[PDB]
């Protein structure tokens, strides 16, 4: 396990919203310990059998939860995020997509100064297969195991999973950092955890065209992580300077290429997979 476990008590911001609800449902069904939610104005009621509060402070006081998911729309996001930090959540996972870089940019800072953890945004979230769910992560594909994964992209991940799952492996925790250019947590931030997680026997690193992130990690990695890592990068055929769907996916000044990225890991001594379908495979090896 890496960030969340079965003891993790959660709350939702924008709980009564649509996405909020749906998704809450499942977490709920999966056994995630949803302790309740926040929807300004709707304090006082119960949604999904859980209580609904007007403020995070409230919710926290009431439930002692310490994690929170946010289904709040771009424009209001930063507010909630601040709010949470402010209320003493230590872990945030914002799902929202459409977040003005400047906002995030200012937000990361606060996060840091404050010692809070946020995953995201515009990401599936996290699941510690077998104990805890957070995100649009789809339930039944995971198998409790020794694989650890980080990814900038959601769907891809699901591929991975499938494999490790069919390859017998199973996953410790699944981490979807989100695909915006400026995240709350990055490769490193996590890797570091994996490295220190007794249950994580090896890792799958996933990324695409975009920043340095990858590069940066290798570095770290090489000279900071012992467990074995298989890595893969999406975007080889990508065009220059075109946002490829995910906002943070774009080739800036002829910088941020698939290849670079690849090259860069292999150097750090990384098991690089040209083909996506090969993660199970590749692993096998490094995994034997």
């Amino acid at each position: 396990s890496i960030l969340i476990d079965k003891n993790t008590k959660v709350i939702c911001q924008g709980f009564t919203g649509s996405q909020g609800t749906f998704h809450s449902e499942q977490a709920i069904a999966y056994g995630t310990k949803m302790v309740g939610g926040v929807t300004p104005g709707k304090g006082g009621t119960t949604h999904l059998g859980l209580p609904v509060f007007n403020t995070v402070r409230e919710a926290v006081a009431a439930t002692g939860a310490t994690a929170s998911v946010i289904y709040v729309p771009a424009p209001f996001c930063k507010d909630s995020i601040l709010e949470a930090i402010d209320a003493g959540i230590k872990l945030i996972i914002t799902i929202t997509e459409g977040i003005p870089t400047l906002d995030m940019l200012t937000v990361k800072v606060k996060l840091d100064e404050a010692g809070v953890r946020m995953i995201g945004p515009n990401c599936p979230g996290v699941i510690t297969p077998g104990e805890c769910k957070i995100g649009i992560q789809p339930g039944h594909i995971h198998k409790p195991g020794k694989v650890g994964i980080v990814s900038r992209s959601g769907t891809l991940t699901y591929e991975a999973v499938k494999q490790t799952t069919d390859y017998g492996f199973g996953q410790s925790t699944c981490v979807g950092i989100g695909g915006d250019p400026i995240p709350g947590s990055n490769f490193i931030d996590i890797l570091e955890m994996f490295e220190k997680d007794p249950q994580t026997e090896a890792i799958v690193m996933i990324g695409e065209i975009g920043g340095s992130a990858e590069e940066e990690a290798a570095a770290y990695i090489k000279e900071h992580v012992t467990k074995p890592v298989v890595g893969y990068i999406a975007g080889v055929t990508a065009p220059k300077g075109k946002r490829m769907g995910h906002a943070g996916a774009i080739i800036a000044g002829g910088k941020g290429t698939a290849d670079e990225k690849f090259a860069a890991l292999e150097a750090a001594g990384v098991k690089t997979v040209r083909s996506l379908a090969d993660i199970g495979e590749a692993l096998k090896t490094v995994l034997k």
Partner: protein
């Protein structure tokens, strides 16, 4: 979103930044009228297109006479300019900038972006005016000075001085520059941009600083809170399809190959393309299905991808989904007919209802192929296409 030179200038002005006197024309007549609104020749006439390399292209020229102007305009409005940064059939010229010629002592270089790596907006300058920095930096990397805005305080003057000196300016020039940096540093923040590029920042013989050119980019994500910007968008400048796509929560980007892809998720999409080329395929596009793969949605995709008569096959690849595998299948089928796709289709379903889906697919009778596994489908498509 990109803006036009002219719009940029206009803003600079709104902010107090220095720029040439100019007028954006739409007809040769207005163009030819500006000259004497501007005064004494000779004047500068630039095509307002969103691409760079405008110069080399022939869309920027110094002129000596009213008529000379008429001409250029005549020559360009309506036509499509093509720069090295342009596509193939380029962009369309619909406006033309007419400004005053400038007295060029030096050429500097000013710009800002968001430094992912350092998670900051950094402004950077350099003495190497009138040249692409990607270059410059690529090789005289020490010719760039940088500074990073602090989020805590805004931007401060020391930072501007700083560079100014780093640039070796003196006197009022230094005062001036400060002014500008402060100037842009603010707009940046005020209007949620993503990027700025004054190249060249110029020094006039008369010894003043002035933004000969401007290039901006705004953060799509904040439009919702930048109505001015909002209004300024020039759809005329991008691939219309891309626009259609969005109208259906789709993320389209047109490519070069012959193989259509339609996938559920950006990650996948890329990876998927990638895997294909891997199997010798030539992806002809990137499509990312953002809504729920409903019928209309899939149908709409279809149209789009198919807009490019080049494509010879399509690869659908669905994995997660809020839609039942079987469900989608249906639509795809549906889709295939409604639209009328006369091209082979490879399909990679996954998730729920997956088998049922592939079957329905198959029993369909159409030219659809339920793919066994990812890499299978890959082959299959490359397959079918290569057939020719």
């Amino acid at each position: 979103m990109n803006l036009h030179e002219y719009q940029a200038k206009q803003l600079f002005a709104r902010y107090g930044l220095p720029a040439p006197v100019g007028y954006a024309c739409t007809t040769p007549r207005e163009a030819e009228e500006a000259a004497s609104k501007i005064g004494a020749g000779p004047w500068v006439v630039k095509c307002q297109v969103h691409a760079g390399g405008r110069g080399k292209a022939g869309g920027v020229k110094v002129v000596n006479s009213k008529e000379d102007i008429r001409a250029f305009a005549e020559n360009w409005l309506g036509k499509r300019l093509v720069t090295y940064q342009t596509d193939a059939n380029g962009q369309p010229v619909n406006q033309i900038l007419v400004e005053a010629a400038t007295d060029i002592a030096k050429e500097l270089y000013l710009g800002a972006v968001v430094d992912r790596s350092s998670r900051r907006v950094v402004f950077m300058a350099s003495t190497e005016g009138g040249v692409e920095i990607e270059k410059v930096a690529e090789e005289t990397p020490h010719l760039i000075h940088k500074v990073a805005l602090d989020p805590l305080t805004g931007p401060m003057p020391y930072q501007g001085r700083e560079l100014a000196f780093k640039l070796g300016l003196e006197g009022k020039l230094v005062q001036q520059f400060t002014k500008i940096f402060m100037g842009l540093a603010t707009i940046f923040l005020e209007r949620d941009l993503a990027l700025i590029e004054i190249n060249p920042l110029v020094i006039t013989k008369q010894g003043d600083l002035i933004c000969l050119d401007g290039k901006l980019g705004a953060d799509g994500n904040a439009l919702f809170r930048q109505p001015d910007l909002r209004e300024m968008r020039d759809q005329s400048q991008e691939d219309p399809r891309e626009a259609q796509a969005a109208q259906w929560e789709l993320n389209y980007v047109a490519l070069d190959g012959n193989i259509g892809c339609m996938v559920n998720g950006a990650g996948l999409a890329m990876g998927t393309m990638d895997i294909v080329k891997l199997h010798g395929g030539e992806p002809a596009n990137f499509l990312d299905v953002g809504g729920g793969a409903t019928k209309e949605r899939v149908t709409e995709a279809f149209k789009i991808i198919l807009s490019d008569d080049k494509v010879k096959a399509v690869l659908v690849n669905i994995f997660g989904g809020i839609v039942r595998c079987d469900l989608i299948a249906d639509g795809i089928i549906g889709a295939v007919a409604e639209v009328g796709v006369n091209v082979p289709v490879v399909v990679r379903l996954e998730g729920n209802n997956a088998e049922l889906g592939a079957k329905k697919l198959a029993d369909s009778g159409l030219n659809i192929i339920a793919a066994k596994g990812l890499t299978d489908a890959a082959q299959q498509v490359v397959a079918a296409v290569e057939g020719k």
